[PDB]
Structure 1
């Protein structure tokens, strides 16, 4: 049992400081990681001794604070377990930092390998004295192209003393890239020496660089290089194969087939996938890359003995989270019970082909193999291509299918109709057309005598830089991409449909290549059938332009459909998915949900604030009506997500557009289900959902349904992302409620009572929403680890999103705990804190996805320079807080319910 000695300063204030110092440290570390090499961020923060000092100090502070709080005399078992998870997790992390080592390994078909080469960099000294065969020492060094760090080292080896000092290093490009050449001074015994030492890249310490001297200490060796470590067993591989979606170079799967050789003289076989691993003898093997000649494999290995302590830690943390969320006592149930008491040739053919519904009804269902490897119904392909050519959804009364069919069959018209959109005056003037943009036409961009006017500009423009684009260059590259798309359509190379010939990898051919292959093949039968299809369909189109029956071309479309079902392989999707995809394209909810969300939120906020400004409660009818309406709209939303999941055949939260849709879903879930009792929570939640769907629909995000990267194919995709991105819903709800309670603070005029109880209830609602958000963020982060311990190769490596998730955990832990240290002001300080704290989450999402490098790039993009808009928004927030500060005095434990309380 602890006694209260002067050394026991342990009290919450010390935990808030420690968490603050830790958070600032990791932040500065992450920005150093960008302005200097990652080796400079391993230095100064992550591998620095004082960081381990902070870790042990934090553990001791957890023990001291729990002893001083009389946690064990009271029951509080849930808090004890939850909090003990941290003490374990930290122990496991320490064990891994001290005993666990990492390695990379290279293997070639038929090669046997029993040694692995470290990824860090070492300097090696060996001494031999005529007495004493060898002594050997290794020292780690943090120097490369971007950082220099003088080594100073004093050691005793043969038993005499030795010193080494190092100056700097130049990067001369003497063949091997830049053979690193470094200069050094030594003292051994009285002898003092000056020496030049050189290494190859991240490869073996070759003999040539190995440099040996024989003055004091007999004969001595010095080298600078990568270390090699020797396995007790041995490995051989006999395959590397990777499988790329049919019809595309996009790699779907990476595979190795591997045999394991040991005095268990029967070999043991295993096969390996990007998201699968091997465990043998205490070693774990993942698969990262492969030799560029596609017959060599690269593996990463982690002998991390701290695995099981950290996993038990994660299990304790999850059990504690569930326990505290269902505990009868504790903060969450107390706030729930509190809130329960409160009240709160043919140029006019457009119109001709507009009415072709009888044709398009079948045309929209012929499958096409997109260049991404996925098989699309032609409706989706037509939508994508036309919405890329013409920025408006409909070029004329023609829907996308009609205009696609028209520009396919009558290039002589549609290449001279103004449709290719442009948004730059300099581009239009350099083309010699009038200033009015007006969707320039395909024929206008090159001359019969000429080649292609923009060619000279794009070759100058594209390679320069994404980060300092110009209003001219942006539209130049964009219009070039659009013209390339149009050329693909006019050539017919996009209709990779008519055959499913089983010659290539599995790729479906386009019609002219189809005819060529059928002619190359003695399959004249197929050639003449395809010719009949072509002739019938073209004649039917001609008839439909000059008349109006269309049944001929519709029958030809039915013919190509039945040819699909006849010749196609296992790639053919069932008609159910085709129907689902066409429905999701026609009645896409995510474009329609955005505005009604915002407008309903605004009107409901106005109605509720009118009541709170007065001293009358809002009539139940209004709550019931808006609640049922929001619930119907939420059901429509979740059905939209369900259809995207079903048609994608993968979880619909994996490519940073879906992620925005799922954050919207989590935000609306928080308001509709959990906090349904309160009007202001529902208002804030629906407002958040609307705003984030609008941001997603700003057009920067790519919304089309693509196939998964191979790494993402793990089951953990369903649990890591879902919980992590659900956290942002509740945290954004906390942000919105913070702004709302600050406005309520402004309204307070000491004549009004309702305002006071309103703020007092909003504080608790914000607090419990923050509890839920934190818990989700913590659990999702750590489980994600359990997933990064299979995909990447280590469960924590201080990656740029890893560290910022931890920063967010730290900030919200500070905000939740500060209720223990700052009495009297509590509602206002908590409001301010819950408003400012959301900057950590906005950073962890946007900044880490765009403005910082890292491995978790599953949702990244090119960094546009930060808009001053956000700076003005932050200035507005800070001004609002300063103004609200004038009325902050309203203690938390007030008294008279109804009259107040």
Structure 2
């Protein structure tokens, strides 16, 4: 009966302590991860028995706390669903612990492989009992080099049980032989002995057949290394392939094209692009690496039956959050009701010579060109995309993208010294030099004084391992290699994919040069000279134009080009009206500009409402009318622009990732405008959500902008995830601000102006509401990351830097909220203190981890002020939170 459990003291008082213990453990894990720099941290905490008991303790106490609170006598269903989920989540992780297979699969031509090779290391012990039997055991013993654990496993049953010990990693490798030597001792009745292990290479234990001991009942077999597991079906390669970028002989994309077969089930072919996955059984396969002989490829493999229950838990959690945010008698709506109750050829001047014309651009935008992905495009968009992926700036020093495109084409050697290419990490620039706080590099910078492309070796080594989770640097090298190859393609004309190779579609659409040299010269063509003199006139007029500025000869040349394409292309020839309309859209669309107002308006309305409640009198409805009218105007403009988007582009609002989040922002601002011509803060929140979603979506088309043949980060899950996390941190910052304001106000009250106490209560309520929103959004967000990882790059959630700390933020804010039930009185001041203090978890997750993947006394200057403020303000902390009052009272 529960009376004993009450003497176990399972109640909020203890649930808080368990959550705090879990948080501090998952935190300290980060520091030991750094200092040990290895899996040793997982040895101490993540996989230790600590959690394997603490999670059960937690679940049981949750159950007990709901029982003692009689949560099911009251109806309260939405909150039940919420804590119902976490139980499902944790039990799912639990099952994932025991049944989570893992390993690597070595696919090779004509091999017909059956074995997974595990990355989990193991030691092996076997004894041929005098009965010549096979008693065997496998012990994990996951040491590598930074940790050398004393084994304590002593099991066998043919006779007097085995006992074993490990001493020291006395390895002597020379890389001609992989001598991972290690010394150990073994015990048997009257026959204890000392031994050497010498683990073999990570490929497979075969040489470790040492056979250290022989006597029947004493014969022994020891090994240390990887084990293998057999699938129920065979796999083989059809033909591996690895394309190169032409300008660097560097790898572009992997392709497997494998086959699956069984002894009676006929073979099934299957295809795997570098981002694709195979699923035939419970197993799932991720292509992750290729052997440098380029005749075999490695697949990452996982099986985890815990997936479906955990997904059910995620769905339950989403539904619970959405339901609780509106269910009356929920704390959020109840605080809302409380609030409502109380209320040659040099660079300089070439930029000008390009910019101040626009005449050619007005028509060269109108040419039709291929992306060589397979899609025709109007020039403006292709050049926009190329310039945007080279320079992440929406615009350069000048030169609307088409202008810089022409410039790089026909004044190349100058732009070759311009710092176009963007680079993130300073480590990469450390190879190229000039390691200031630079944002860009020049194309010349990547070459030796000789013709050597210097980054080639770094990238060639990195791409072989980059597809998995990796250091930033391992991503930056390949991104910059891609951008460099694209700039090479922009040079020497290999992007001006104008001329069709045949009158019938048969579309390849050749370059300028090899068009003349090949198809044009090879085939009769006749249009040879025409095309020759057309392109030559183009080049001549352009190279003259920088001098004369009345270069319209290139404009007539462009008319010639367009007429040629018009009378040489087939049905692929888009109508001129549609081309004009597409460019017209790409210029006029609002979604770039609209990022700022949705934020600014929300903040400016929020601050004035804050000034209102700080003096406890309500704001005149005049401002409500004004700002609702402004939101209405922005909404009308946005809706019409989005409708025009749908009208011009057939992208079917179940569209590309970019437009989908535009529709989500539309929905958010709509919810704002339609249902809430009642309360200003609803406009604030709705506009802020729409603004954040819009900004993240627009950014999602800037950096991930496609070039050719490479995939990008357009996955719906990742975009939603980033947007949610950003909004959550915004809400949490607002919480921090409000709490700090409460702490300051506590200084002011002197019993002469009791109104400030009603203001205190109002602010505490608003802060708690905003923190509830923050916590719910952060909860959903953090798990969307685990969803994304599971379906994109690999296994699942995994104890990882910044992930544990997002979990710590969740944990701390959970502590803060339920806290209500523990602390008996003076809730306002307590809550203000905690709301300010807990912000450091978000600050960690956002900035600090990037330092701690030291004494920056800036943080000391911050925390000392916070501490002294709390100190002094505590002197007058006596207030309470009733829910029925007016005027002098709340």
Residues 233-242 or 500-509, more deviating: 500-509
C-alpha separation between the residues in 1 aligned to 2:21 and 2:10? 16
C-alpha separation between the residues in 2 aligned to 1:556 and 1:286? 50
After superposition, the Cα gap between the structure-2 partners of 1:301 and 1:56, relative to the gap in structure 1 and judged at 3 Å, is: same
Q: CA deviation at 1:193?
A: 2.0
Q: CA deviation at 1:43?
A: 0.5
Q: What per-residue deviation string (whole Å, max 9, x for no partner) do you get for residues 154-184 of structure 1?
A: 2334312322221221443322575321111
Would you say the 8 A contact 1:245–1:374 is kept in 2? no
Would you say the 8 A contact 1:651–1:717 is kept in 2? no
Q: What per-residue deviation string (whole Å, max 9, x for no partner) do you get for residues 29-78 of structure 1?
A: 23333333442122111110111111111011111111111122222233
Would you say the 8 A contact 1:354–1:398 is kept in 2? yes
Would you say the 8 A contact 1:362–1:557 is kept in 2? yes
After superposition, the Cα gap between the structure-2 partners of 1:571 and 1:756, relative to the gap in structure 1 and judged at 3 Å, is: farther
Q: What per-residue deviation string (whole Å, max 9, x for no partner) do you get for residues 68-97 of structure 1?
A: 111222222332232122222222222221
1:867 maps to: 856
After superposition, the Cα gap between the structure-2 partners of 1:211 and 1:574, relative to the gap in structure 1 and judged at 3 Å, is: farther
C-alpha separation between the residues in 2 aligned to 1:41 and 1:434? 34
C-alpha separation between the residues in 2 aligned to 1:835 and 1:895? 27
Residues 134-143 or 534-543, more deviating: 534-543
Residues 280-289 or 790-799, more deviating: 280-289
Q: What per-residue deviation string (whole Å, max 9, x for no partner) do you get for residues 300-321 of structure 1?
A: 3334333443344334333333
Structure 1 position 690 matched with structure 2 position 679: no
Would you say the 8 A contact 2:343–2:617 is kept in 1? no
Q: CA deviation at 1:343?
A: 1.2
C-alpha separation between the residues in 2 aligned to 1:675 and 1:509? 57
1:540 maps to: 541
Q: CA deviation at 1:448?
A: 13
Would you say the 8 A contact 1:497–1:511 is kept in 2? yes
After superposition, the Cα gap between the structure-2 partners of 1:447 and 1:214, relative to the gap in structure 1 and judged at 3 Å, is: closer
After superposition, the Cα gap between the structure-2 partners of 1:496 and 1:143, relative to the gap in structure 1 and judged at 3 Å, is: farther
Q: CA deviation at 1:807?
A: 2.4
After superposition, the Cα gap between the structure-2 partners of 1:322 and 1:7, relative to the gap in structure 1 and judged at 3 Å, is: same
Q: CA deviation at 1:260?
A: 4.2
1:149 maps to: 149
Residues 703-712 or 64-73, more deviating: 703-712
2:222 maps to: 222
Residues 197-206 or 557-566, more deviating: 557-566
After superposition, the Cα gap between the structure-2 partners of 1:817 and 1:872, relative to the gap in structure 1 and judged at 3 Å, is: same
After superposition, the Cα gap between the structure-2 partners of 1:516 and 1:147, relative to the gap in structure 1 and judged at 3 Å, is: farther
C-alpha separation between the residues in 2 aligned to 1:427 and 1:111? 39
- For 1:30-429, list aligned pairs within 5 A: 30-175=30-175, 178-207=178-207, 210-215=210-215, 217-240=217-240, 256-262=256-262, 264-268=264-268, 270-272=270-272, 282-343=282-343, 355-366=356-367, 379=380, 401-402=402-403, 405=406, 408-409=409-410
Q: What per-residue deviation string (whole Å, max 9, x for no partner) do you get for residues 389-444 of structure 1?
A: 99999999866644654565457998999999999999999999999999999999
C-alpha separation between the residues in 1 aligned to 2:723 and 2:407? 43
C-alpha separation between the residues in 2 aligned to 1:268 and 1:391? 43
After superposition, the Cα gap between the structure-2 partners of 1:284 and 1:505, relative to the gap in structure 1 and judged at 3 Å, is: farther
Residues 592-601 or 522-531, more deviating: 592-601
After superposition, the Cα gap between the structure-2 partners of 1:724 and 1:444, relative to the gap in structure 1 and judged at 3 Å, is: closer
C-alpha separation between the residues in 2 aligned to 1:142 and 1:762? 53
Q: CA deviation at 1:587?
A: 6.2
After superposition, the Cα gap between the structure-2 partners of 1:105 and 1:669, relative to the gap in structure 1 and judged at 3 Å, is: farther
C-alpha separation between the residues in 2 aligned to 1:267 and 1:425? 50
Structure 1: any 5+ residue segments left out of the alignment? 853-864
C-alpha separation between the residues in 2 aligned to 1:435 and 1:782? 38
After superposition, the Cα gap between the structure-2 partners of 1:829 and 1:164, relative to the gap in structure 1 and judged at 3 Å, is: same
Q: What per-residue deviation string (whole Å, max 9, x for no partner) do you get for residues 631-678 of structure 1?
A: 545776899999999999999999999999999999999988898855
Q: Secondary structure at the match of 2:127?
A: strand
Would you say the 8 A contact 2:289–2:464 is kept in 1? no
After superposition, the Cα gap between the structure-2 partners of 1:433 and 1:270, relative to the gap in structure 1 and judged at 3 Å, is: closer
After superposition, the Cα gap between the structure-2 partners of 1:500 and 1:327, relative to the gap in structure 1 and judged at 3 Å, is: farther
After superposition, the Cα gap between the structure-2 partners of 1:741 and 1:723, relative to the gap in structure 1 and judged at 3 Å, is: same
Q: Secondary structure at the match of 2:706?
A: coil
Q: 1:882 aligns with which of 871, 879, 884?
A: 871
After superposition, the Cα gap between the structure-2 partners of 1:597 and 1:230, relative to the gap in structure 1 and judged at 3 Å, is: closer
Residues 629-638 or 459-468, more deviating: 459-468
C-alpha separation between the residues in 1 aligned to 2:749 and 2:764? 15
C-alpha separation between the residues in 2 aligned to 1:424 and 1:280? 40
Q: CA deviation at 1:497?
A: 5.3
Residues 616-625 or 667-676, more deviating: 667-676
Q: CA deviation at 1:685?
A: 8.7
C-alpha separation between the residues in 1 aligned to 2:646 and 2:364? 25
Q: CA deviation at 1:204?
A: 0.8
After superposition, the Cα gap between the structure-2 partners of 1:661 and 1:842, relative to the gap in structure 1 and judged at 3 Å, is: farther
Aligned residues: 889
Q: Secondary structure at the match of 2:198?
A: strand
Would you say the 8 A contact 1:825–1:888 is kept in 2? yes
Structure 2: any 5+ residue segments left out of the alignment? none
After superposition, the Cα gap between the structure-2 partners of 1:651 and 1:560, relative to the gap in structure 1 and judged at 3 Å, is: same
Q: What per-residue deviation string (whole Å, max 9, x for no partner) do you get for residues 171-229 of structure 1?
A: 43322575321111122222232222122332111235644332573532111111012
Q: What per-residue deviation string (whole Å, max 9, x for no partner) do you get for residues 453-488 of structure 1?
A: 999999999999999999999999999999999998
Would you say the 8 A contact 2:123–2:223 is kept in 1? yes
Q: CA deviation at 1:621?
A: 0.8
Residues 353-362 or 431-440, more deviating: 431-440
Would you say the 8 A contact 2:385–2:706 is kept in 1? no
Would you say the 8 A contact 1:274–1:287 is kept in 2? yes
**Aligned-residue RMSD, C-alpha:** 7.2
Q: What per-residue deviation string (whole Å, max 9, x for no partner) do you get for residues 320-353 of structure 1?
A: 3333234333223323333332319999888776
After superposition, the Cα gap between the structure-2 partners of 1:873 and 1:732, relative to the gap in structure 1 and judged at 3 Å, is: same
After superposition, the Cα gap between the structure-2 partners of 1:703 and 1:382, relative to the gap in structure 1 and judged at 3 Å, is: same
After superposition, the Cα gap between the structure-2 partners of 1:695 and 1:870, relative to the gap in structure 1 and judged at 3 Å, is: farther
After superposition, the Cα gap between the structure-2 partners of 1:572 and 1:836, relative to the gap in structure 1 and judged at 3 Å, is: farther
Would you say the 8 A contact 1:176–1:201 is kept in 2? no
Q: CA deviation at 1:795?
A: 3.1
Would you say the 8 A contact 2:697–2:719 is kept in 1? no
Q: What per-residue deviation string (whole Å, max 9, x for no partner) do you get for residues 769-821 of structure 1?
A: 33333333333444543443333443333233543333232222212211111
After superposition, the Cα gap between the structure-2 partners of 1:607 and 1:270, relative to the gap in structure 1 and judged at 3 Å, is: closer
Would you say the 8 A contact 2:705–2:712 is kept in 1? no
